[PDB]
mmCIF file of C-alpha atoms and ligand atoms in Angstrom:
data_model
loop_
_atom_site.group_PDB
_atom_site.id
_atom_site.type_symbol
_atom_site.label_atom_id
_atom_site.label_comp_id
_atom_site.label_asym_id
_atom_site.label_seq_id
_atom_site.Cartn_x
_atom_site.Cartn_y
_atom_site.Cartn_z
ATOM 1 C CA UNK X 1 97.344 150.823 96.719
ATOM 2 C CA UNK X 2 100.983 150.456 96.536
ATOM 3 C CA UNK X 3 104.903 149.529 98.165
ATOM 4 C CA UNK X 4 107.035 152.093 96.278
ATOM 5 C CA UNK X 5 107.969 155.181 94.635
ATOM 6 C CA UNK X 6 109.400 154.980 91.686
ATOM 7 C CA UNK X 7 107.858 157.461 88.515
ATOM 8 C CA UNK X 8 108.142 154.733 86.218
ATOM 9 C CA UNK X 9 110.376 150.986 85.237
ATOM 10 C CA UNK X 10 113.805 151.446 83.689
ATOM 11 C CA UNK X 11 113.843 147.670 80.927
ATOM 12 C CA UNK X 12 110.528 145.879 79.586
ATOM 13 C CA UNK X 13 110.381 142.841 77.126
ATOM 14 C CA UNK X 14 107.805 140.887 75.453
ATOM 15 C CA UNK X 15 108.562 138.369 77.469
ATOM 16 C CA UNK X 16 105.978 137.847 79.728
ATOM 17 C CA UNK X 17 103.179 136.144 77.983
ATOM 18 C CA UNK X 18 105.091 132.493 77.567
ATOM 19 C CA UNK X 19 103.247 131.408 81.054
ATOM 20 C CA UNK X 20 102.572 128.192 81.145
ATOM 21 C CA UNK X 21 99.661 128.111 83.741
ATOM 22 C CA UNK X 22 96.473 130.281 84.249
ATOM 23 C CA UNK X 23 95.833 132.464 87.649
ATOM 24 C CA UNK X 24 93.254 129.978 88.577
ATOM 25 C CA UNK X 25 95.757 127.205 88.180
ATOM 26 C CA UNK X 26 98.582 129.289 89.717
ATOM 27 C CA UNK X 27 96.618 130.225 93.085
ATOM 28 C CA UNK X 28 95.905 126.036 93.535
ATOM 29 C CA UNK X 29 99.563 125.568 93.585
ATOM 30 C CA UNK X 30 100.390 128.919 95.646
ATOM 31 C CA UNK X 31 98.194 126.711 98.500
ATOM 32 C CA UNK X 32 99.945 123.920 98.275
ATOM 33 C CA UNK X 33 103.419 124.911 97.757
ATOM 34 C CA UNK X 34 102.912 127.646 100.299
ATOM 35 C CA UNK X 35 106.164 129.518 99.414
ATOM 36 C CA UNK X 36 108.549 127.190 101.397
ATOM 37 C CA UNK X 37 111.547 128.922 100.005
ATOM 38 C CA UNK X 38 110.132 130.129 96.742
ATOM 39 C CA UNK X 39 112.232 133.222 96.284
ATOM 40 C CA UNK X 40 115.820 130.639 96.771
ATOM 41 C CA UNK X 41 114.791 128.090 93.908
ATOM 42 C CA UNK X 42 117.689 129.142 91.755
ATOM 43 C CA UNK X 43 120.329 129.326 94.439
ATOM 44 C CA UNK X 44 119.662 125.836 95.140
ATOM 45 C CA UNK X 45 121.354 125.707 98.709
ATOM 46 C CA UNK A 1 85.111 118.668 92.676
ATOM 47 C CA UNK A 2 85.515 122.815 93.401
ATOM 48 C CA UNK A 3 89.021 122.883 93.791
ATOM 49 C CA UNK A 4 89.641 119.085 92.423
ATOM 50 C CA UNK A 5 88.971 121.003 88.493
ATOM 51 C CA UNK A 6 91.812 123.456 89.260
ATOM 52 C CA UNK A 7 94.248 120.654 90.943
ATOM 53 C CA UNK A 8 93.436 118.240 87.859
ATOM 54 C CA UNK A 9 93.789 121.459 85.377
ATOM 55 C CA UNK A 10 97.776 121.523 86.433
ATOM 56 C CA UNK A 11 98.455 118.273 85.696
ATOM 57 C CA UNK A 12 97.983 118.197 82.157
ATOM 58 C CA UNK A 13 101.071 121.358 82.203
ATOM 59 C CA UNK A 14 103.050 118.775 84.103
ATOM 60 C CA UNK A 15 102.479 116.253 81.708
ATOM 61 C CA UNK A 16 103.616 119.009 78.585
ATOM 62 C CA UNK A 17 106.727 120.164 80.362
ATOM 63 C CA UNK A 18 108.115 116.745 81.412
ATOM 64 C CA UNK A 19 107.429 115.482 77.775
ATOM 65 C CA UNK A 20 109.214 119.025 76.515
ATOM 66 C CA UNK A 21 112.120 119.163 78.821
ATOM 67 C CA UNK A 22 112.528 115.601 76.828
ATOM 68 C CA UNK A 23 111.092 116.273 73.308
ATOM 69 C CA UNK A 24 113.043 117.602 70.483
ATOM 70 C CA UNK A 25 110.684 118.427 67.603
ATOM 71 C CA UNK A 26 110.837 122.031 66.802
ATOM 72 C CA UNK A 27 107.181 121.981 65.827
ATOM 73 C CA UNK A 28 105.898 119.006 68.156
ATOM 74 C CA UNK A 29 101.925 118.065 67.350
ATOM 75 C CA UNK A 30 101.599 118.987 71.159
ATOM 76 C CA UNK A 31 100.166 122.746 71.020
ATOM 77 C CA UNK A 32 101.558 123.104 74.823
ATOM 78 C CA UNK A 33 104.985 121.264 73.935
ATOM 79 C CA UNK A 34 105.829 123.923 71.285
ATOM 80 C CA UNK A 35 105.236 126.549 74.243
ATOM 81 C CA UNK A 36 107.128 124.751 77.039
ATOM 82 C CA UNK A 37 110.301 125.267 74.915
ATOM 83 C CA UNK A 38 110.021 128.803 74.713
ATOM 84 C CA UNK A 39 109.114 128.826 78.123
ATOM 85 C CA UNK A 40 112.433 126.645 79.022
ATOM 86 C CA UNK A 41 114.499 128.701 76.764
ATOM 87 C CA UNK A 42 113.629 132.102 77.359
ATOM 88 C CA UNK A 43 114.343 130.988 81.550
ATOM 89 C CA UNK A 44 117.492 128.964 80.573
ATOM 90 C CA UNK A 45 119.117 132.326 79.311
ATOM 91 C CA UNK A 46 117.094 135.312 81.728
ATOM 92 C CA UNK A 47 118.686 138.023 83.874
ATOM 93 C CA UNK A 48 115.163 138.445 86.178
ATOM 94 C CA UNK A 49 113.764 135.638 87.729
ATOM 95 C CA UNK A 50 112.122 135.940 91.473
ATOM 96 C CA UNK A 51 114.467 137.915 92.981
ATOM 97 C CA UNK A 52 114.202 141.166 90.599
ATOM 98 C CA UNK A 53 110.682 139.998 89.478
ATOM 99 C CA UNK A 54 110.521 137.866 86.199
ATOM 100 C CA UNK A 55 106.804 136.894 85.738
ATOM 101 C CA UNK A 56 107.868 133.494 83.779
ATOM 102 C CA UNK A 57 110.084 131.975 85.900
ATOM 103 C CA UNK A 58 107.961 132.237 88.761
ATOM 104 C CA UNK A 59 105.462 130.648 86.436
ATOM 105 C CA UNK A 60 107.701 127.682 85.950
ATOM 106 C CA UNK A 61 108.656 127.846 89.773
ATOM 107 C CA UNK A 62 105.025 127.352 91.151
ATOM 108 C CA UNK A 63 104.684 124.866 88.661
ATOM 109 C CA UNK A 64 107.927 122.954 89.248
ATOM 110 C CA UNK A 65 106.919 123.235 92.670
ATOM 111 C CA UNK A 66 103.849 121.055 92.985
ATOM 112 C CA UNK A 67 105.630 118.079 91.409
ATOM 113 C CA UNK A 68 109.005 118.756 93.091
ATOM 114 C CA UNK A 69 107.424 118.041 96.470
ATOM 115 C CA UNK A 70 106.048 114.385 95.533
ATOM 116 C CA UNK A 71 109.185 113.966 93.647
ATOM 117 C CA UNK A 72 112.290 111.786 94.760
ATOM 118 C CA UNK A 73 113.919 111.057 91.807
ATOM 119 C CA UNK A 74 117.670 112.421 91.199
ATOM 120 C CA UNK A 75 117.359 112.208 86.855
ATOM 121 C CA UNK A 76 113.926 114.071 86.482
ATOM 122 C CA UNK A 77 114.119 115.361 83.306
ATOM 123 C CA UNK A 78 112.618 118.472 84.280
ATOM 124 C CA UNK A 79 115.753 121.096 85.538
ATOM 125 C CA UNK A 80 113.856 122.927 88.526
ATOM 126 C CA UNK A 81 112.312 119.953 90.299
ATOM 127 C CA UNK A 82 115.513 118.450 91.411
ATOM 128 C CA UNK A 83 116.886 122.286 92.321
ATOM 129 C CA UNK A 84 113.750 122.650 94.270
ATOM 130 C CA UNK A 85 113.247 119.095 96.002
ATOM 131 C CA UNK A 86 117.219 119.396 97.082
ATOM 132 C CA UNK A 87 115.906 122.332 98.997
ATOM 133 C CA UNK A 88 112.498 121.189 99.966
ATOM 134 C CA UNK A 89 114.017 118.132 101.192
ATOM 135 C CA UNK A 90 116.134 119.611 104.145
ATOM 136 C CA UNK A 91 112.946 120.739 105.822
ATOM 137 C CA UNK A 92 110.863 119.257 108.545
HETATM 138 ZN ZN1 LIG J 101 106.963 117.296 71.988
HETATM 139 ZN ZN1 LIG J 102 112.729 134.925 83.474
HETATM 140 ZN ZN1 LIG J 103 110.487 115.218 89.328
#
């Protein structure tokens, strides 16, 4: 049920409710987009 | 249309961040525009994103995504698409 460890996070902020697209929504473009190099976006290299 | 109501759902958010990354009413008649700029601003000033595990900016990152790949155009008003098709670009 998990991939860590750790007890407990160490910063939260509210954040994380601006999302601009639902989970339904989300897993549509997760097929197409297929994480080509998802995780480099803001490196752009 | 079973996953044609999901692939036409995201086009309307594509539609309110291209008019926001453009738009500067601070209380635009667009319910979705006034959300796009916090959405924009809060990732134009973060210290998470993907790598440490932002849940916004990988919001804006699928989204930017799916119209970065049709995308060709080198003044999109949107900032991500052109970061992302200058990447996507180089594959094959
Ligand atoms: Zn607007
Ligand atoms: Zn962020
Ligand atoms: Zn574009």
């Amino acid at each position: 049920g998990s991939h860590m460890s750790e007890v407990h996070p160490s910063r939260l902020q509210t954040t994380d409710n601006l999302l601009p697209m639902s989970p339904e929504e989300f897993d549509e473009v997760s097929r197409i987009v297929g994480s080509v190099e998802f995780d480099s976006m803001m490196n752009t290299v | 249309s079973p996953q044609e109501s999901r692939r036409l759902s995201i086009q309307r958010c594509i539609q309110s961040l291209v008019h926001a990354c453009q738009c500067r009413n601070a209380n635009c008649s667009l319910p979705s525009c006034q959300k796009m700029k916090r959405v924009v601003q809060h990732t134009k000033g973060c210290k998470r994103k993907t790598n440490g595990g932002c849940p916004v900016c990988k919001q804006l990152i699928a989204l930017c995504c799916y119209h970065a790949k049709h995308c060709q155009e080198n003044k999109c008003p949107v900032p991500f698409c052109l970061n992302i098709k200058h990447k996507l670009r180089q594959q094959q």
